[PDB]
TrEMBL record, chains A, D:
It is found in: Membrane. This is Potassium channel protein. GO terms for molecular function: identical protein binding; metal ion binding; potassium channel activity. The chain crosses the membrane at residues 7-26, 55-75. It is a multi-pass membrane protein. It comes from Bacillus cereus (strain ATCC 14579 / DSM 31 / CCUG 7414 / JCM 2152 / NBRC 15305 / NCIMB 9373 / NCTC 2599 / NRRL B-3711).
Length: 92, 95, 95, 92
């Protein structure tokens, strides 16, 4: 029972939905490719493509500053939840 | 204005991004918007789909990376703790 | 063996990298060494020069990123504090 | 006077030298491009190329695990030293 995790999850999903909508409508990517671009951008993995429109470039700059902190907060909380069963099985 | 460290990191981040925009548009021939995009994705460690083509560009980018990552991520951290986190919390209050 | 959290993160990291090696060599057709390279650069956030071409590959990679980054960086942190830092310190002692 | 910073600097330079030597001899890159590859790898910015030899791929995997922590420790210490004059000029 972790409302902090639940809220971070919601915020992450909503942020990825917004990017998917944006890149699929403004940059003309298939939904899966718009989601992929959004994910590799906010996780800092990085893309092998870039936006073609000035609007898309500006959006991506702002999207990084809006979303990078949240995404890494979520990744951290996710890691705690995913590794804890193994830690506890190896402890008590 | 309450957190002076945040104020400094913000100004330094803006100046760093202006410097990169000027550099890449002059030396690497990018349009200013593409030079700003390149600077942002580089200093946040996202990475661009392109890379510098000139030796000057490569050397500058190495130095810009080392100095710039620390500042931009210091700014992102302060933005998260001083702006985004309080805004999220406020927006979760039932009214 | 003294730090059980480090032990768990190490094993989980190895299993995660084996899973990626198997996945990318089967679904994306990469040689195993290229699948391992891709998995490593992806989960450390370095990023590859390539990207998945199949929709299965794209979906898997999104999930692998979210689960894998946290584990691999947990491992890197533990490796730094429990192995690399004590080794550096020991190697700086005049004898 | 910061021996911690001095040591991190030395370790970083030696690590970048080793990568420059490796990628310029094994992967046939010009020195500047071997240094660039080493830097964007350890800082996690990422490269638009990859090693062509199996030896180079294996080396890069190990190089990441050997060097990423040190490089980020250095980047942090560098940031403290670079921003402190501005903070202090804005304070005392
Ligand atoms: Cl178990
Ligand atoms: Cl422009
Ligand atoms: Cl192979
Ligand atoms: Cl001053
Ligand atoms: K990338
Ligand atoms: K690329
Ligand atoms: K483009
Ligand atoms: K990239
Ligand atoms: K990165
Ligand atoms: K890359
Ligand atoms: K990257
Ligand atoms: K990159
Ligand atoms: K290659």
């Amino acid at each position: 029972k972790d409302k902090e995790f639940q809220v971070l999850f919601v915020l992450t999903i909503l942020t990825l939905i917004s990017g998917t909508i944006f890149y699929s409508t403004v940059e003309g990517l298939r939904p899966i490719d718009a989601l992929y671009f959004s994910v590799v951008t906010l996780t800092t993995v990085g893309s092998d493509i870039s936006p073609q429109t000035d609007f898309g470039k500006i959006f991506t700059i702002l999207y990084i500053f809006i979303g990078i902190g949240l995404v890494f907060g979520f990744i951290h909380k996710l890691a705690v939840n995913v590794q804890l069963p193994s830690i506890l099985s190896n402890l008590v």
